[PDB]
Amino acid sequence: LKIDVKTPAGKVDGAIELPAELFDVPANIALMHQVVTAQRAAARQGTHSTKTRGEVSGGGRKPYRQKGTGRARQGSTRAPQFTGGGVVHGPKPRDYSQRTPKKMIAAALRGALSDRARNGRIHAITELVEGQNPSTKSARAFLASLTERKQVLVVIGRSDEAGAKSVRNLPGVHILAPDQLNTYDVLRADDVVFSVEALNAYIAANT
Template sequence: MATATKLEVFDAKGKKAGSVDLPEAIFGAETNVPLIHQVVTAQLAAARQGTHKTKTRGERSGSGVKPFKQKGTGRARQGSVRMPQHRGGGIVHGPVPRDYSQRTPKKMIAAALVGLLSDRARANRLHVVEGFGIADKPSTKTAREFLAQVAPGNRVLVVVDREDVLTVLSVQNLPNVHVLFHDQLNAYDVVVSDDLVFTKAAFDAFVDGRAAKEDSK
């Protein structure tokens, strides 16, 4: 399925309010599934704290004397109550603090995101709206009703610009709805979402930002 060169923009009432151009470099790229898997796996790995720790035999508290004499008891010889087979003893080959992050080149990260955005555009799962119709104060009800019209998917990712505080406050408590600023868009949040909803301001800022990065190379 070919990617449309234009995408309709809807207003707060769900009616057509214009259109935006879909740059071929961002929304017409090939979707490389193995690359996306590698980038998402690296992103999840980097999010791990890696602070897990168990105590070895030498770190456990307890006496260092033998629990009973070496010979004459008929039991297996034991050197310390801190040995792993004793209750409260050390752990053998347990986890230790480590860094789970994986080196992922920036070009791979960018290619994975572009591939996902192109896939959402081809599947008609990319939406651009003028706004949520929230003017004075946050309204979760208004945001919920609007998203039900625009984005039919079970999991929705809303992308806004950093000035749109009212929209953030309105959608952040909705179940199965995640909100990001346009400069936080990443492969993981896109791949776990069924529908992607941009505000017009966020879409323009994202496209302009990508174009600026390409020009600076």
């Protein structure tokens, strides 16, 4: 509710109290389930194509007449049951996205983050740079010296000087801007790291 981490290459600074949105929420696993599966549904490209009768070349001829041949009533040379035939009830290239209520999305997100606050997994850091240029090595020492976990979510913002360059090439580390803070990354990652600006922007947008 009211805790702050240390500062890189320093001592301690900040001390920002977290609002109720990140603590007083009874997160519901069914809600988070539905929202997460919506995200996985959106992640699909829907490229699963096939070929049905009519796209298969030819097949309009009706060989093997119905008298004096002793063969089955063929009727077409590209029917499903034939080698090289069409696919019946195939995976047509669907294009979909499980549209959900915005209140469900927000409630699930603040629920997950509030659970992280309950377990002390929020590391609202201040920055990560050697002044202006990136240093992945120093990023490794910082993140692996304060968090000591595999999967980490990093929220910086629109700062590309030492934002999504120092944290890159760190297996398990993903990065995003506050506006795109989804839930799947939050549930996958444990020690969720925020910048001061990440907290100000998130809180301001979310009252």
